[PDB]
């Protein structure tokens, strides 16, 4: 395609939900960027994301619509948290680095949420890291523009593991709380080195949540029994103590995680409130052990 004459494709980074992603060099400026090519209201709203700038949001440099393709040109980062997690499987990511990452991601969310922008599909694969100790949120704003499909453009299953229960239960309106839920699940996975709720279908996802957190009821979540996909026949599981769910996380960490995984999105902690949590009293910005 013509647009691609502006860039040398250096390597394929991967397959995203919507399109293929390439590390590229701008043939003229020599700038190294990540190029997402999506095969085709969405243009207008994605274009508005160019102003949604923050140090913990992957910079959107350009939005180009040309020949039934949409190209999104981003800042390039060298690693994603999913691969970092897998690489850290023997040892675990050190707690101070987990804490720094969580603090940074909450800052990114606080920013986007203050501008009434949600992500809606946070997952380790779209959390990108650099050598300086930064982590940044990728694909912010794309799910609103395109939806979140069941399969990706290459037919891969879009993971349900981070999806908030209100979405699974069929709520029409997503609040910023969906992103806090996803981040809580990611926090837990960093700590324990296993996904918290690895569902392989919507019902399995919902049941895994319920097995850990208890089957939700009107006590904990007003209105849940009126949600579109709620069934009175759901099994009633008891809630498990977080001390079991995420050892060896400390009391402050378990408190915060619990608040990020409240069922009621109106009760779930906000990004701004999370930043103030005592868990972060001693937050630092360590440099991650990396090889590129």
Task: Specify the residue for token string 């579109």.
Answer: 228
Which residue, 81 or 106, is less far from ligand 8QT as judged by CB?
Answer: 81
In sequence order, what DSSP letters do the residues of 36-93 get, joined into one string?
A: EEEE--HHHHHHHGGG---TTB--EEEEEEETTEEEEEEE--SEEHHHHHHHTTTT--
CB of 234 to ligand 8QT, least distance (A): 32
**Does position 138 bind ligand 8QT by CB under 6 A?**
yes
List of residues 6+ apart from 238 with CB closer than 8 A: 214
Q: Kindly state the number of chain residues that form the binding site for ligand 8QT, as judged by CB under 6 A.
A: 20
- And the tokens for 183? 């981040």
Q: Consult the annotation and say whether 139 binds a ligand.
A: yes
Does 56 participate in binding ligand 8QT (rule CB under 6 A)?
no
Q: How far is the CB of 229 from ligand 8QT (least distance, A)?
A: 27
Residue span binding ligand 8QT (CB under 6 A) among the ranges 15-23, 112-120, 159-167, 220-228: 15-23
Distance between CA 269 and CA 258 in Å, rounded? Answer: 9
Binding of residue 36 to ligand 8QT (CB under 6 A): yes
Helix (H) or strand (E) holding 257: helix 251-260
List of long-range contacts for 43-48, beta carbons under 8 Å, 24+ apart: 43/70, 45/141, 45/144, 45/145, 46/70, 46/72, 46/141, 46/142, 46/145
Contact flag: residue 139 with ligand 8QT (CB under 6 A): yes
Q: Which residue is nearest to ligand 8QT (CB)?
A: 14
Q: How far is the CB of 162 from ligand 8QT (least distance, A)?
A: 13
Does 76 bind ligand 8QT (CB under 6 A)? Our answer is yes
* Residue 57 or 249 having the CB closest to ligand 8QT: 57
**Does 108 help bind ligand 8QT (rule: CB under 6 A)?**
no
**Residue 186 found at the interface with ligand 8QT (CB under 6 A):** no
- Closest listed residue to residue 154, CA positions, set 9, 40, 37, 20: 20
* Dihedral sign of CA atoms 264, 267, 270, 274 in order: negative
The contact set with ligand 8QT (CB under 6 A) reads 13-16, 21, 34, 36, 58, 74, 76-80, 83, 125-126, 128, 138-139
Binding residues for ATP: 13-21, 36, 75-77, 80, 123-126, 139
């Amino acid at each position: 395609p013509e647009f691609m004459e502006n860039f040398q494709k250096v390597e394929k980074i991967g397959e995203g939900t919507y399109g293929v992603v390439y590390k590229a060099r701008n043939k003229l400026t020599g700038e190294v960027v990540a190029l997402k090519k999506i095969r085709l209201t969405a243009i207008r709203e994605i274009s508005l994301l160019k102003e949604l700038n923050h140090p913990n949001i992957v910079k959107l440099l350009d939005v180009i619509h040309t020949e039934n393709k949409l190209y999104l040109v981003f800042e390039f980062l060298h690693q994603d948290l999913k691969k970092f997690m897998d690489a850290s499987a023997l040892t675990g990511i050190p707690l101070p680095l987990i804490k720094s990452y969580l603090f940074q991601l909450l800052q990114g969310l606080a920013f986007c949420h203050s501008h009434r922008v949600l992500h809606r599909d946070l997952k380790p694969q779209n959390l990108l890291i650099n050598t300086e100790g930064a982590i940044k949120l990728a694909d912010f704003g794309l799910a609103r523009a395109f939806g979140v499909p069941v399969r990706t453009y290459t037919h891969e299953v879009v993971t349900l593991w981070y999806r908030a229960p209100e979405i699974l239960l069929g709520c029409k309106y997503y609040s910023t709380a969906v992103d806090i839920w996803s981040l809580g699940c990611i926090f837990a996975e960093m700590v324990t080195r296993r996904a918290l709720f690895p569902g392989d279908s919507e019902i399995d996802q919902l049941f895994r949540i319920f097995r850990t957190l208890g089957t939700p009821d009107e006590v904990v979540w007003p209105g849940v029994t009126s949600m579109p996909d709620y069934k009175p026949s759901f099994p009633k599981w008891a809630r498990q103590d977080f001390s079991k769910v995420v050892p060896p996380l400390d009391e402050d960490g378990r408190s915060l995680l619990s608040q990020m995984l409240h069922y009621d999105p109106n009760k779930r902690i906000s990004a701004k409130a999370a930043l103030a949590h005592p868990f972060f009293q001693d937050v630092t910005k360590p440099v991650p052990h990396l090889r590129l």
